[PDB]
Design an enzyme around this catalytic site. Sequence first.
Site, PDB file in Angstrom:
ATOM      1  N   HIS A   1      13.979  89.552 115.892  1.00 36.78           N
ATOM      2  CA  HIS A   1      12.560  89.314 115.648  1.00 36.78           C
ATOM      3  C   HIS A   1      12.432  88.849 114.191  1.00 36.78           C
ATOM      4  CE1 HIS A   1       8.573  90.269 114.332  1.00 36.78           C
ATOM      5  NE2 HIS A   1       8.230  90.198 115.610  1.00 36.78           N
TER       6      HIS A   1
ATOM      7  N   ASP B   1      10.404  89.016 111.600  1.00 33.82           N
ATOM      8  CA  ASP B   1      10.117  90.003 110.564  1.00 33.82           C
ATOM      9  C   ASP B   1      11.312  90.911 110.343  1.00 33.82           C
ATOM     10  OD1 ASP B   1       7.426  89.157 110.106  1.00 33.82           O
ATOM     11  OD2 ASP B   1       6.645  90.589 111.598  1.00 33.82           O
ATOM     12  N   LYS B   2      11.940  91.368 111.426  1.00 35.00           N
ATOM     13  CA  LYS B   2      13.102  92.224 111.311  1.00 35.00           C
ATOM     14  C   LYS B   2      14.300  91.512 110.695  1.00 35.00           C
ATOM     15  CE  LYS B   2      12.133  96.477 111.799  1.00 35.00           C
ATOM     16  NZ  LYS B   2      12.636  96.625 110.365  1.00 35.00           N
TER      17      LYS B   2
ATOM     18  N   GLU C   1      12.256  90.416  98.527  1.00 34.30           N
ATOM     19  CA  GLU C   1      11.528  90.005  99.730  1.00 34.30           C
ATOM     20  C   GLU C   1      12.289  88.863 100.379  1.00 34.30           C
ATOM     21  OE1 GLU C   1       9.467  92.104 100.231  1.00 34.30           O
ATOM     22  OE2 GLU C   1       8.250  92.593  98.512  1.00 34.30           O
TER      23      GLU C   1
ATOM     24  N   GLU D   1      12.523  90.390  92.512  1.00 36.08           N
ATOM     25  CA  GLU D   1      12.988  90.835  91.203  1.00 36.08           C
ATOM     26  C   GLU D   1      14.226  91.692  91.359  1.00 36.08           C
ATOM     27  OE1 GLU D   1       9.748  92.084  92.193  1.00 36.08           O
ATOM     28  OE2 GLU D   1       8.989  89.985  91.949  1.00 36.08           O
TER      29      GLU D   1
ATOM     30  N   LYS E   1      10.632  91.932 121.706  1.00 32.54           N
ATOM     31  CA  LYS E   1       9.604  92.940 121.442  1.00 32.54           C
ATOM     32  C   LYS E   1       9.438  93.797 122.684  1.00 32.54           C
ATOM     33  CE  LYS E   1       6.061  91.960 118.815  1.00 32.54           C
ATOM     34  NZ  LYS E   1       4.790  91.354 118.340  1.00 32.54           N
TER      35      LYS E   1
ATOM     36  N   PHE F   1       9.553  81.877 126.859  1.00 40.06           N
ATOM     37  CA  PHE F   1       9.901  82.305 125.507  1.00 40.06           C
ATOM     38  C   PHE F   1      11.264  81.691 125.178  1.00 40.06           C
ATOM     39  CE2 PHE F   1      10.030  86.646 122.987  1.00 40.06           C
ATOM     40  CZ  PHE F   1      10.243  86.005 121.791  1.00 40.06           C
TER      41      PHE F   1
ATOM     42  N   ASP G   1       7.829  81.839 114.964  1.00 41.11           N
ATOM     43  CA  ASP G   1       6.888  82.708 114.262  1.00 41.11           C
ATOM     44  C   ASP G   1       7.511  83.051 112.923  1.00 41.11           C
ATOM     45  OD1 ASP G   1       4.686  84.636 114.100  1.00 41.11           O
ATOM     46  OD2 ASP G   1       6.110  86.186 114.625  1.00 41.11           O
ATOM     47  N   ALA G   2       6.787  82.836 111.839  1.00 37.43           N
ATOM     48  CA  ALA G   2       7.328  83.155 110.540  1.00 37.43           C
ATOM     49  C   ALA G   2       7.635  84.648 110.471  1.00 37.43           C
ATOM     50  CB  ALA G   2       6.309  82.791 109.479  1.00 37.43           C
TER      51      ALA G   2
ATOM     52  N   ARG H   1       6.728  93.698 107.279  1.00 38.33           N
ATOM     53  CA  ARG H   1       5.687  93.417 108.239  1.00 38.33           C
ATOM     54  C   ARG H   1       5.879  94.169 109.556  1.00 38.33           C
ATOM     55  NH1 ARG H   1       2.114  88.844 107.297  1.00 38.33           N
ATOM     56  NH2 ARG H   1       1.852  88.943 109.513  1.00 38.33           N
ATOM     57  N   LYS H   2       6.793  95.145 109.566  1.00 36.31           N
ATOM     58  CA  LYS H   2       7.075  95.977 110.715  1.00 36.31           C
ATOM     59  C   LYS H   2       7.088  97.427 110.271  1.00 36.31           C
ATOM     60  CE  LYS H   2       6.719  93.270 114.127  1.00 36.31           C
ATOM     61  NZ  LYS H   2       5.691  92.631 113.242  1.00 36.31           N
TER      62      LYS H   2
ATOM     63  N   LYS I   1      14.476  97.401  98.609  1.00 35.11           N
ATOM     64  CA  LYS I   1      14.066  98.210  97.476  1.00 35.11           C
ATOM     65  C   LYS I   1      15.064  99.317  97.177  1.00 35.11           C
ATOM     66  CE  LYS I   1       9.131  97.647  98.502  1.00 35.11           C
ATOM     67  NZ  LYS I   1       7.879  98.277  98.904  1.00 35.11           N
TER      68      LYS I   1
ATOM     69  N   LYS J   1      11.921 102.833  93.860  1.00 36.83           N
ATOM     70  CA  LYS J   1      10.693 102.446  94.550  1.00 36.83           C
ATOM     71  C   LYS J   1      10.411 103.555  95.544  1.00 36.83           C
ATOM     72  CE  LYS J   1      11.938  98.337  92.757  1.00 36.83           C
ATOM     73  NZ  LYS J   1      12.964  98.214  91.700  1.00 36.83           N
TER      74      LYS J   1
ATOM     75  N   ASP K   1       8.065 103.936  97.550  1.00 39.45           N
ATOM     76  CA  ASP K   1       7.672 103.500  98.887  1.00 39.45           C
ATOM     77  C   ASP K   1       8.778 103.846  99.880  1.00 39.45           C
ATOM     78  OD1 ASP K   1       5.194 102.227  98.451  1.00 39.45           O
ATOM     79  OD2 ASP K   1       6.096 100.312  98.162  1.00 39.45           O
TER      80      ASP K   1
HETATM   81  C1  LIG Z   1       5.154  98.196  90.411  1.00 41.57           C
HETATM   82  S1  LIG Z   1       5.224  96.575  91.281  1.00 41.57           S
HETATM   83  C2  LIG Z   1       6.534  96.873  92.523  1.00 41.57           C
HETATM   84  C3  LIG Z   1       7.921  97.000  91.868  1.00 41.57           C
HETATM   85  C4  LIG Z   1       8.517  95.664  91.384  1.00 41.57           C
HETATM   86  N1  LIG Z   1       8.738  94.676  92.436  1.00 41.57           N
HETATM   87  C5  LIG Z   1       9.790  95.862  90.570  1.00 41.57           C
HETATM   88  O1  LIG Z   1      10.530  94.891  90.430  1.00 41.57           O
HETATM   89  O2  LIG Z   1       9.998  96.984  90.067  1.00 41.57           O
HETATM   90  C6  LIG Z   1       3.832  96.683  92.423  1.00 41.57           C
HETATM   91  C7  LIG Z   1       2.501  96.397  91.753  1.00 41.57           C
HETATM   92  O3  LIG Z   1       2.303  97.230  90.612  1.00 41.57           O
HETATM   93  C8  LIG Z   1       1.558  96.533  89.654  1.00 41.57           C
HETATM   94  N2  LIG Z   1       2.328  96.373  88.414  1.00 41.57           N
HETATM   95  C9  LIG Z   1       3.110  95.307  88.059  1.00 41.57           C
HETATM   96  N3  LIG Z   1       3.582  95.467  86.808  1.00 41.57           N
HETATM   97  C10 LIG Z   1       3.122  96.700  86.384  1.00 41.57           C
HETATM   98  C11 LIG Z   1       3.251  97.390  85.184  1.00 41.57           C
HETATM   99  N4  LIG Z   1       3.958  96.954  84.144  1.00 41.57           N
HETATM  100  N5  LIG Z   1       2.592  98.575  85.074  1.00 41.57           N
HETATM  101  C12 LIG Z   1       1.840  99.072  86.129  1.00 41.57           C
HETATM  102  N6  LIG Z   1       1.726  98.454  87.327  1.00 41.57           N
HETATM  103  C13 LIG Z   1       2.338  97.264  87.377  1.00 41.57           C
HETATM  104  C14 LIG Z   1       1.163  95.175  90.206  1.00 41.57           C
HETATM  105  O4  LIG Z   1      -0.090  95.361  90.897  1.00 41.57           O
HETATM  106  C15 LIG Z   1       2.267  94.975  91.235  1.00 41.57           C
HETATM  107  O5  LIG Z   1       1.929  94.081  92.263  1.00 41.57           O
HETATM  108  C1  LIG Z   2       3.431  86.069 119.412  1.00 39.11           C
HETATM  109  S1  LIG Z   2       4.179  85.719 117.766  1.00 39.11           S
HETATM  110  C2  LIG Z   2       2.716  85.788 116.668  1.00 39.11           C
HETATM  111  C3  LIG Z   2       1.771  84.598 116.905  1.00 39.11           C
HETATM  112  C4  LIG Z   2       2.283  83.260 116.337  1.00 39.11           C
HETATM  113  N1  LIG Z   2       2.478  83.245 114.890  1.00 39.11           N
HETATM  114  C5  LIG Z   2       1.417  82.081 116.765  1.00 39.11           C
HETATM  115  O1  LIG Z   2       1.509  81.044 116.115  1.00 39.11           O
HETATM  116  O2  LIG Z   2       0.685  82.222 117.765  1.00 39.11           O
HETATM  117  C6  LIG Z   2       4.861  87.321 117.297  1.00 39.11           C
HETATM  118  C7  LIG Z   2       6.191  87.611 117.968  1.00 39.11           C
HETATM  119  O3  LIG Z   2       6.098  87.481 119.386  1.00 39.11           O
HETATM  120  C8  LIG Z   2       7.321  87.025 119.890  1.00 39.11           C
HETATM  121  N2  LIG Z   2       7.156  85.726 120.557  1.00 39.11           N
HETATM  122  C9  LIG Z   2       7.329  84.485 120.004  1.00 39.11           C
HETATM  123  N3  LIG Z   2       7.187  83.530 120.942  1.00 39.11           N
HETATM  124  C10 LIG Z   2       6.862  84.191 122.111  1.00 39.11           C
HETATM  125  C11 LIG Z   2       6.630  83.750 123.408  1.00 39.11           C
HETATM  126  N4  LIG Z   2       6.635  82.469 123.774  1.00 39.11           N
HETATM  127  N5  LIG Z   2       6.405  84.698 124.358  1.00 39.11           N
HETATM  128  C12 LIG Z   2       6.392  86.046 124.029  1.00 39.11           C
HETATM  129  N6  LIG Z   2       6.568  86.513 122.772  1.00 39.11           N
HETATM  130  C13 LIG Z   2       6.846  85.557 121.878  1.00 39.11           C
HETATM  131  C14 LIG Z   2       8.326  86.910 118.758  1.00 39.11           C
HETATM  132  O4  LIG Z   2       8.968  88.197 118.648  1.00 39.11           O
HETATM  133  C15 LIG Z   2       7.380  86.728 117.579  1.00 39.11           C
HETATM  134  O5  LIG Z   2       7.937  87.095 116.345  1.00 39.11           O
HETATM  135 CL   LIG Z   3       9.214  96.510  94.929  1.00 36.79          CL
HETATM  136 CL   LIG Z   4       0.366  85.357 113.950  1.00 37.47          CL
HETATM  137 CL   LIG Z   5       5.162  90.182 115.421  1.00 39.98          CL
END
Ligand SMILES: C[S@@+](CC[C@H](N)C(=O)[O-])C[C@H]1O[C@@H](n2cnc3c(N)ncnc32)[C@H](O)[C@@H]1O
Ligand SMILES: C[S@@+](CC[C@H](N)C(=O)[O-])C[C@H]1O[C@@H](n2cnc3c(N)ncnc32)[C@H](O)[C@@H]1O
Ligand SMILES: [Cl-]
Ligand SMILES: [Cl-]
Ligand SMILES: [Cl-]
Lengths: 383, 383
Positions: A17, A19-20, A45, A58, A169, A238, A246-247, A252-253, A273, A277, A279
């Site tokens: 998938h 996202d995965k 990311e 980063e 899915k 499919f 699908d991007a 996102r999961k 991460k 982090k 999270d």
């Molecule tokens: C802390 S960053 C996530 C960690 C980051 N990707 C890293 O490389 O460590 C998440 C959010 O915190 C906020 N942030 C970024 N720089 C920060 C800083 N120096 N102090 C506090 N919050 C910050 C911004 O809103 C950012 O999108």
């Molecule tokens: C349905 S797509 C999200 C909508 C899409 N971005 C669009 O343009 O309509 C989300 C997920 O569904 C699954 N998918 C993609 N094509 C599909 C299809 N033809 N039938 C069923 N599921 C599908 C894939 O796992 C995909 O990542």
């Molecule tokens: Cl992060």
């Molecule tokens: Cl979508």
């Molecule tokens: Cl999805």
Amino acid sequence: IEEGTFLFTSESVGEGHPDKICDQISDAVLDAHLQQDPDAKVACETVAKTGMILLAGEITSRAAVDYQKVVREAVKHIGYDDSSKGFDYKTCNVLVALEQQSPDIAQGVHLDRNEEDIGAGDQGLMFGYATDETEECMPLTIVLAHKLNAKLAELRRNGTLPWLRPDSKTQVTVQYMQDRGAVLPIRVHTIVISVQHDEEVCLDEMRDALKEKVIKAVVPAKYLDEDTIYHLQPSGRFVIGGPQGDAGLTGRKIIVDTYGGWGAHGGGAFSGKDYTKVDRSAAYAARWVAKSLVKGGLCRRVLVQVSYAIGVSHPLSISIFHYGTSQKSERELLEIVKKNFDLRPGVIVRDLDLKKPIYQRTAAYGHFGRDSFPWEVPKKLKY
Amino acid sequence: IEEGTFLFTSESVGEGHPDKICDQISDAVLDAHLQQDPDAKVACETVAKTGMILLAGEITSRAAVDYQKVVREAVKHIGYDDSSKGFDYKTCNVLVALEQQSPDIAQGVHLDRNEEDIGAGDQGLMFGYATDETEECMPLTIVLAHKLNAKLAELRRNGTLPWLRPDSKTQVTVQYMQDRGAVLPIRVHTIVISVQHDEEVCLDEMRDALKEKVIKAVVPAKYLDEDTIYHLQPSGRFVIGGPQGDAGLTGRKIIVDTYGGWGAHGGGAFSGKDYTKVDRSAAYAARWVAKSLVKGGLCRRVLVQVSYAIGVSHPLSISIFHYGTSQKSERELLEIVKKNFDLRPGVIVRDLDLKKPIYQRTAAYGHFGRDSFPWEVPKKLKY
Ligand SMILES: C[S@@+](CC[C@H](N)C(=O)[O-])C[C@H]1O[C@@H](n2cnc3c(N)ncnc32)[C@H](O)[C@@H]1O
Ligand SMILES: C[S@@+](CC[C@H](N)C(=O)[O-])C[C@H]1O[C@@H](n2cnc3c(N)ncnc32)[C@H](O)[C@@H]1O
Ligand SMILES: [Cl-]
Ligand SMILES: [Cl-]
Ligand SMILES: [Cl-]
Ligand SMILES: COc1ccc(N2Cc3cnc(NCC4CC4)nc3[C@]3(CCN(Cc4ccn[nH]4)C3)C2=O)cc1
Ligand SMILES: COc1ccc(N2Cc3cnc(NCC4CC4)nc3[C@]3(CCN(Cc4ccn[nH]4)C3)C2=O)cc1
Ligand SMILES: [Cl-]
């Protein structure tokens, strides 16, 4: 629906998938850094679309990482190895937009700090949940959903169903009985399965295989009855799938990664991460707390919330909700948690061994309830 | 913590937080298409890093959209207009990786279908929640968190605090009293605020302003006391911010967009998606159901789950949980919902007017509890 019973639904997705894919790549990158530099600061990311994997984020690390090789190997493992499948690790574009970690974050979080006293890498809130309805203390809805995806991949890889492709899915609705704040699964109400497939196989062959070789090989017959509803290949076709269909993006999961809608979620994604982090590390620790409370016989079902401020090591507060399944009060449970756990990230890293490069293994089929990761091994509680 | 009371935490982020930038851009793109083609099929992800906005995804539309102009105008509105702030709409890179919607999805969802009978655009699960603890039926924790971010932007834009920049995060912990399944806010326990700032202003000036001009202008004094904990600029320095400090992606703030950890979440992101994507339309409808149940005096607090299979118009099931705040049973509430609502996407679009180009307005400060959008106007219930 009889009084005292109710329905609940969760979903899962397969390794291909889109996202995965991104979560797995982000964690392959993290693991590659950790193999060389256990203190790597990683915030990687991944974005996937037709023909493209982009890394953005980063990283500050002493490691020398070949991103082309790491990404392409992750895609190979997933099974996207030919243009006929819509994506090929050998010939896709891998683009990199990676910078050092912000020095302003670094100075506020970890620079010149004792490891145990490292600040949280961000603010945020995180929850941990556990439920004794399965031995691994996870909701059955999501366990079954994950296992359906795993079964697809197994039958793809062993050549049983060679028309399968990696993108899938699944979604499972279970009817439950209330049981003194715990829940007891009764029956499976509805199953959805969609999986990418080759151009040659017909719909009837797929739907028959999905019922007989996938569902029946995963879901105990005792939960399935004449009234169970099956939506198998409900879109009808499919063939286009993966990032071409699908991007995908990392993180996102997040409900598939956790509790399938049960419990609660604070919003943070895990993959890509390092342990600073919260999270990820505090969500893992909160799962560990919850699972420890249930396996230690204090709760049958429990939800924990913790939260942090960037730069501050101790959680801002902790709260425990036991659904009526403990004889101990909320206050008593919190006391037990405070005496047995230390949820500063620089202590969690030690307790859960979070510099170890095991993260790509977490990035499909859920981070919880599997494989005896350290956060799945209950702590023996003293009180 | 007195027995019968408890803590809860939620967060919010500002318009220039990099994830939120992406949500706003995704919805600016959706709105631009809808202005010309109300039936545009849009699935537009946005990724942001230093100097870059990338659009990735799937759009099939009769509209002719200038992506350069739409993106740059969204960034301008947010306030990133100079290299000294870390990001500039005039001079950033805008990259586009957009394809048509997959024909396999199109044929399974909407091709040759009566609009009311369009299939769900995906499988998935969605929740709606409402709580009578505020008039707008939202958790106070997240309402206050959003308002703190809005206050920052207001004082940035009016020139009161010209050292502020657009990227901010806030987090609020409230102590609540149980009240017959409802909840009653008692006091604010902890507030976190981090906001990007210029190179000249000192920490003490910022922390004083954040307390006196932000917190006191937002949070009623009755909730603040000598024991309230304040973490203001806890990292100590936040000059680098926006996408330069941290990558952003669409759909990475899904708990900020919804209930701040209360209720539940099914995992789907809202921004960048037209009404056929039930991740958005069914979540909006479920909010509308929940808010209708509370404003109609049936519940004081309520959670609704719905779920779908791709290609199938009706929800697979619906369930209502009223936290003990209704005299009606679960079964009765479900009957009332089924008689008053039709949660097929092709009916939701009509009830909630979801072809209208109002989506960029939803993409910061939460999608719920604000501005009397159609899903915030309760339906009068018949029963
Ligand atoms: C802390 S960053 C996530 C960690 C980051 N990707 C890293 O490389 O460590 C998440 C959010 O915190 C906020 N942030 C970024 N720089 C920060 C800083 N120096 N102090 C506090 N919050 C910050 C911004 O809103 C950012 O999108
Ligand atoms: C349905 S797509 C999200 C909508 C899409 N971005 C669009 O343009 O309509 C989300 C997920 O569904 C699954 N998918 C993609 N094509 C599909 C299809 N033809 N039938 C069923 N599921 C599908 C894939 O796992 C995909 O990542
Ligand atoms: Cl992060
Ligand atoms: Cl979508
Ligand atoms: Cl999805
Ligand atoms: C005396 O023993 C008992 C008493 C009551 C329970 N019930 C009864 C019950 C009934 N209906 C629904 N319909 C699903 C809904 C989504 C609307 N959910 C529940 C939940 C299960 C999920 N709960 C909310 C939740 C979801 C995510 N986080 N929290 C509440 C629960 O616990 C269990 C044992
Ligand atoms: C008789 O009246 C009553 C009886 C009980 C309640 N309580 C008591 C209570 C006590 N502690 C915590 N600690 C927060 C925790 C996260 C661990 N949460 C609650 C929740 C509020 C959030 N609830 C879970 C939840 C979170 C997201 N979804 N669901 C359960 C609730 O409702 C309210 C009125
Ligand atoms: Cl963030």
